[PDB]
Design a protein around this ligand. Sequence first.
Ligand SMILES: Nc1ncnc2c1ncn2[C@@H]1O[C@H](COP(=O)(O)OP(=O)(O)OP(=O)(O)O)[C@@H](O)[C@H]1O
Ligand SMILES: Nc1ncnc2c1ncn2[C@@H]1O[C@H](COP(=O)(O)OP(=O)(O)OP(=O)(O)O)[C@@H](O)[C@H]1O
Ligand SMILES: [Mg+2]
Ligand SMILES: [Mg+2]
Lengths: 600, 600
Amino acid sequence: MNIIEIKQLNRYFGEGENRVHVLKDISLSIERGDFVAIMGQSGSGKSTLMNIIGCLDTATGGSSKIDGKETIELTNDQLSDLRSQKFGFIFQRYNLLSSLTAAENVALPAIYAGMPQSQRLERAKQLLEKLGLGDKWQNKPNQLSGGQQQRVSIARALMNGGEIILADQPTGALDSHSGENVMEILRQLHEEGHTIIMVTHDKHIAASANRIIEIKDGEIISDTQKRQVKSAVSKDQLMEAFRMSVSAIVAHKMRSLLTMLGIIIGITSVVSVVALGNGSQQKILENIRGIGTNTMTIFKISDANTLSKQSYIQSVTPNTSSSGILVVGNKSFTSANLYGIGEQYFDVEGLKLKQGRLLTEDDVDQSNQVVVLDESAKKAIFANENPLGKTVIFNKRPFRVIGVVSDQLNLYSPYSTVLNKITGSITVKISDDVNSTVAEKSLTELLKSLHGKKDFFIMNSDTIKQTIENTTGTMKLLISSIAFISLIVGGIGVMNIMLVSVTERTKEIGVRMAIGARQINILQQFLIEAVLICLIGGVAGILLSVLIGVLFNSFITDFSMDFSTASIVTAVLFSTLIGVLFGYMPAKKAAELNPITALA
Amino acid sequence: MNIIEIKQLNRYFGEGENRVHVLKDISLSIERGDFVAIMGQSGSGKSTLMNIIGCLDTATGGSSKIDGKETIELTNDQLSDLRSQKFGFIFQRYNLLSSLTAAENVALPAIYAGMPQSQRLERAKQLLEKLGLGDKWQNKPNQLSGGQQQRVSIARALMNGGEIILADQPTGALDSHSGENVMEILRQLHEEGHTIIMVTHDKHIAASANRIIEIKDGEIISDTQKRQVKSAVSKDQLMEAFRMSVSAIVAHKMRSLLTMLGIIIGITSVVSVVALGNGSQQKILENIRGIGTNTMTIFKISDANTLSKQSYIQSVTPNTSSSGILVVGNKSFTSANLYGIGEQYFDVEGLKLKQGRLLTEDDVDQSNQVVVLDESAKKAIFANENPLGKTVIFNKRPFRVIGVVSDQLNLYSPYSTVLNKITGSITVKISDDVNSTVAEKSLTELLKSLHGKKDFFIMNSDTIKQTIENTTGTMKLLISSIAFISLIVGGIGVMNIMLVSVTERTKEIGVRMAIGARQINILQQFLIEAVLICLIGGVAGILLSVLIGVLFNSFITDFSMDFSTASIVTAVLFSTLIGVLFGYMPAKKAAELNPITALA
Ligand SMILES: Nc1ncnc2c1ncn2[C@@H]1O[C@H](COP(=O)(O)OP(=O)(O)OP(=O)(O)O)[C@@H](O)[C@H]1O
Ligand SMILES: Nc1ncnc2c1ncn2[C@@H]1O[C@H](COP(=O)(O)OP(=O)(O)OP(=O)(O)O)[C@@H](O)[C@H]1O
Ligand SMILES: [Mg+2]
Ligand SMILES: [Mg+2]
């Protein structure tokens, strides 16, 4: 019976005193397959009514029903169908996508309908033939005249062959020839049973309509008919969406490259400060560990034998000293010290080999008369001359100098040599990883298991092992809070550049919604636009930092940038989960507001 | 004679095969004060010629002369004058600024002319009266119909009363009433001696012209006259620019807030990592310094007296030991050690006061029999009981226990007590700031100045003083390269958000250029927009970090975030010098391209 039925239609804009009554109790039924012209004075409400009909706006009050179905009660996808297949909208200001060619702009409504791309380009091209722009099918909107852009808009409206054609001043910018041809087209679609509702100011145009409504001040003045009326009788979706996203990204080279370089940094920063931090910790903790060791002085040799058979004890020394008199040259250095020490004593106290060698196993087994010299008691006795080989005399008893060591007269001989050839404790080096007060109570246990009840007045020096654990806690807090900054820094960095760049195309959404796209079709390409730009700039990131590391480890002597694979994951899994969230969120808020509101 | 003289005018677009010949050897003289209508088929070259006349485009070849002056040879400011005062341009697609009201859009050309704002709003309002939009003077473009926007465009063209009025389809979107009124206006300006060149498609409109030119395919077909023709007879600048910048900033709340929060971070990051870094260095270097001191053992008392009178020597100790036997209870600890030490020895070796007191001056002056105990030789002798007061017996000679100290049987008495009451070197503490091998050769000098030629076999331990200087160099590199990152991070952060947000209004520039603004008038508000948004987000920055510091120093036990005033300056002077450079650069590249090219 009727195709459109608008009863009691009201429409307001604005917020009193800024509010205006724009459509005033409009009641209009349009007959199926009619040709209708709407005329009126500039700013009377004509475009506003056209939008509510084609489901771009929605009225403040009153019913509007397409094929008798109330539009407000329809679902958001149900509406997006009407806009793809029921309506075909020629916009007043033509609303083309500026990055697309003419042809591409025409075919676009037919992606959301889901026709194969080979068919689209040929049809779109034929629509531009019929309308006179077969010449310009490759031109983008801003390479066309206004009247050309207008005809591209007309083409697009005709692309999905919608039953109803809403034409809002479709000849405004065109000569009478071009304008007639366009009327020719519209007339033929009327003849093929389409329904035409056309806003116009030119009367010659309005004559091609059988019905002519006049609007003034939001109300309906005229209603004229020449005759009576005739009676009436997601898988590929994503392949396409991906293609959309890519050309979208290539079209906006700047926005894209900056967005992606935004994420690149918010990775390489976080990663390069985690790896700078752990590199300087290695060196700082090492500079401390090399200042002296941590040991437990027990102040027989089978005790110190099995003491050395742990993994929580790294080295062991039997100890025994001697107070006596040395001789070299004429000089006779009185009250010298000959420390009878173990195989591994130079490990246990971390003394470093300067010159020659240290006490081998053969020397302690044979009670060899060989002495390793203290740096200070080496230079004093031998001036600046090689002391290797040359002899000393401790208590009228020769000793062959076999090497020199670091500091903390001191002389180091085997314990077997001092208990055999000079006179007749047990120190252990507690491991770096094991806990200090654990081992103080692990050694109490493990030795008392060798019966002897005492004297376990066991002393142990562990102030290095303290100020390591003390400065590892400080270096953790530093690296941890520095990473937490640099991460929050370049997450906001991404959010800014993302929030801007996507909201910068909320009109592009409003167009896509008006020409048939369904809510989710938006979210498809805007997710794909994000992930595609996020996991390129991710890959760029992880391997840009790598290159920085190589540059740093090359030029930097002091410490090495040592990476963490945990940070790499964290930084990437963060900087994309944030960039995708802020690529989606704004696109989704756009696609869900009324197309016209998006269009401004 | 003539006002416009166009000889041999050619015009191409595009790059073969994409290039098109669009204006073909056009020769057109227009007579001063004429009323001219240009007609033609859609896309024949009409708008293109209109732009070259009004100095928005420039021709590929051939002359174009306004009042006989060749336009290409004019200077860029000379052109910006013509656009403010010679021409008044009604654009085809109306090209309003969307953030301005109707009135504001109309007056804008008259800021660059430099009329007082009180006069502008009243005139702009009157132009909107004459054209029918006195009702809507507060509406922004996107609160108007197309025909309303059109009339706002017309108003603006008439605002500077330009002699020539280029009107590109100025009735396209308006009813015959509104359109006639507009023709009424244009006719009256013709009557007041203005010159009118008007592109149109409507003939009734073209009849109001005395001359009617037809263009087709870039060439001139018709030329008709009804009659012959009549013969012809920076200081405030910145105040305004500032106002422009502010409303501009308030209009773009998002772009602005993000840009400014962009700089906020690129300060607070750099500053919080400099201050985290120096805080953790303080603690790490302290944890090292407290592990032991650096000293120079000289191994009489007036020597050690004047040795202590330096600022490169912090404390001094006379030294003398004793090997003997202690007694408490029945127990009799054999070969104990009684170190005869100085006033300040517990400073010199950094031993810390546990319990009671240390050797006062009165004790060393009186040779007091009082002993300070080693942590270990205190606990061993007195189990877990207070040893303060209670007596020991070193070599059948009482000693009153006066306190306890840290470690590195050991007993500490005055040197005067051991050289008087027990038996009958000089150690110095080299200062933290002075260099170590300097003082080794400053003490050689300063003591030999006390005659004595030797024995200056002076030893000194300074491995702490090494591993501080060794880890200050490592902590410098860390803080230095971490600051260098976080700084480059949030300079690019600013550049991105700035580059985007300003290039996002290159059309706004192209409009402003077409309506009279001079090149520098652009740079004025875009500098002011930057500095105004940069030195707000700077202030926000310096005092956001301050608040973070207070939060950190509150909750964090371990080390304190200690700020640098050098970083604060660096970070601010960087993040604004970069943001201003990238706020200016793009605006300036826009303002210097042809207005039409900017308009797309
Ligand atoms: N950047 C460009 N690249 C290629 N071609 C262009 C470019 N700019 C304009 N053109 C072409 O030059 C011609 C200029 O036509 P013009 O803008 O004068 O149209 P018009 O006569 O004003 O149309 P209408 O009557 O609808 O207003 C157009 O046909 C257009 O295709
Ligand atoms: N967001 C808004 N706020 C306030 N007023 C608005 C808003 N949107 C539209 N209007 C007003 O509602 C009216 C709608 O008019 P409409 O868009 O139908 O003009 P039109 O008849 O199409 O004009 P033309 O004939 O020139 O195309 C306008 O007069 C406009 O001022
Ligand atoms: Mg309209
Ligand atoms: Mg035009």
